[PDB]
């Protein structure tokens, strides 16, 4: 059922640099009511919706989500539901749990009780995610022992809505088979997917050091290759352990040229398809985006890469 699931997912995109910036605009994009109609008269099934809660919640515990922020969250999840999209809320860019996961680990518990409670009532297409692409200090061993803490507390008030549990290492493709999964029905595992690195982050400013700009990609039958043989890694172990696949980021930066990123684009997410993984594109409407405000339209054939058809 986990699996039936997964397929309601379906084909993804994340509405980035938005409200997992310090404030919702402070980097590029605010989450107009206006995208949910766009992103599903498009094709998608659904949206995922990265969050920085851990900007607006008290220092003193049990650390309290800023009502107002609640209330936005609500809105945006809201606009989508309406637009019978699926819909993916996470914790994201935790930046104090990345250095002090020990010290920061019962936060994220508590954030997580707050949210499942808040939303406890919603229907099933509503599901959660723990938290982004654990790395830094959070390390595979730590991720192990606190995910099960926060998923816990989740079921208390939520006791079958679907999980997203991320692999740890920034959700490398890699990083699966480093997962201690628990014993639970309604759980997806998630990686993200941006290889070869040095192309789809070709001049990445908040990558030290950014990597030149200038790199290709063919679609040659060795590069397809290697796309196949990590995703065969990750399937390999998801059907050994009974589990769904969620890609839930994956796509080039527009510093490299459009050719290359429309090949890497559509092979990847065929190659999801392949392997019966759900995605998420990286992402709408910014510096990864599929859609242009200024214009108002889709950049094509990009966006034909993501949604297929
Ligand atoms: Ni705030
Ligand atoms: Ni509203």
Request: contains cysteine.
């Given at each position: 059922?986990?699996?039936?699931?997964?397929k309601?997912?379906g084909?993804?995109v994340?509405?980035g640099?938005?409200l997992?910036?310090?404030?919702?605009?402070?980097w590029?994009?605010?989450?107009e009511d206006?995208?949910?109609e766009?992103?599903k008269?498009?094709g998608?099934?659904?949206?995922?919706?990265?969050?920085?809660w851990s900007?607006?919640?008290?220092?003193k515990?049990?650390?309290?989500?800023?009502?107002?922020?609640?209330?936005?969250?609500?809105?945006?999840?809201?606009?989508?539901?309406?637009?019978?999209?699926?819909?993916?809320?996470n914790t994201?860019?935790?930046?104090?749990?990345?250095?002090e996961?020990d010290?920061?680990?019962?936060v994220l518990?508590?954030?997580?009780?707050?949210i499942?409670?808040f939303?406890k009532?919603?229907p099933?297409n509503?599901?959660?995610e723990?938290?982004?692409?654990?790395?830094?200090?959070?390390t595979?061993e730590?991720?192990?022992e606190l995910?099960?803490?926060?998923?816990?507390?989740?079921?208390?008030?939520?006791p079958?809505?679907?999980?997203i549990?991320?692999?740890?290492?920034?959700?490398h493709?890699?990083?699966?088979?480093?997962?201690?999964?628990?014993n639970?029905?309604?759980?997806?595992?998630?990686f993200?997917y941006?290889?070869?690195?040095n192309?789809?982050?070709?001049?990445?400013?908040?990558?030290?050091?950014?990597?030149?700009?200038?790199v290709?990609?063919?679609?040659?039958?060795?590069?397809?290759?290697?796309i196949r043989?990590?995703?065969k890694?990750?399937?390999?172990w998801?059907?050994?352990?009974?589990?769904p696949?969620f890609?839930?980021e994956?796509?080039?930066?527009?510093?490299a040229?459009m050719?290359?990123?429309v090949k890497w684009?559509?092979?990847?997410?065929?190659?999801?398809?392949?392997?019966?993984?759900?995605?998420?594109?990286?992402?709408?409407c910014?510096?990864?985006?599929?859609?242009?405000?200024?214009?108002?339209?889709?950049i094509?054939?990009?966006?034909?890469?993501v949604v297929?058809?």
């Amino acid at each position: 059922s986990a699996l039936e699931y997964n397929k309601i997912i379906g084909k993804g995109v994340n509405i980035g640099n938005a409200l997992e910036a310090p404030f919702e605009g402070a980097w590029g994009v605010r989450i107009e009511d206006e995208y949910f109609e766009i992103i599903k008269k498009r094709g998608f099934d659904s949206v995922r919706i990265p969050i920085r809660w851990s900007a607006h919640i008290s220092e003193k515990p049990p650390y309290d989500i800023d009502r107002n922020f609640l209330e936005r969250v609500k809105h945006v999840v809201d606009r989508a539901l309406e637009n019978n999209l699926t819909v993916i809320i996470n914790t994201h860019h935790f930046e104090e749990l990345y250095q002090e996961p020990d010290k920061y680990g019962n936060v994220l518990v508590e954030i997580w009780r707050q949210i499942a409670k808040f939303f406890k009532d919603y229907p099933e297409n509503l599901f959660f995610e723990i938290y982004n692409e654990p790395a830094q200090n959070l390390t595979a061993e730590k991720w192990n022992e606190l995910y099960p803490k926060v998923l816990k507390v989740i079921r208390e008030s939520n006791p079958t809505r679907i999980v997203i549990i991320d692999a740890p290492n920034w959700a490398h493709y890699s990083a699966v088979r480093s997962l201690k999964l628990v014993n639970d029905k309604r759980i997806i595992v998630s990686f993200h997917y941006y290889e070869p690195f040095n192309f789809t982050h070709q001049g990445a400013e908040w990558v030290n050091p950014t990597p030149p700009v200038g790199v290709k990609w063919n679609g040659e039958e060795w590069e397809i290759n290697q796309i196949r043989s990590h995703f065969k890694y990750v399937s390999d172990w998801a059907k050994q352990n009974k589990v769904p696949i969620f890609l839930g980021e994956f796509g080039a930066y527009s510093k490299a040229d459009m050719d290359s990123r429309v090949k890497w684009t559509e092979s990847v997410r065929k190659m999801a398809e392949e392997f019966g993984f759900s995605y998420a594109y990286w992402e709408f409407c910014a510096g990864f985006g599929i859609y242009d405000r200024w214009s108002q339209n889709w950049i094509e054939p990009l966006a034909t890469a993501v949604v297929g058809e």
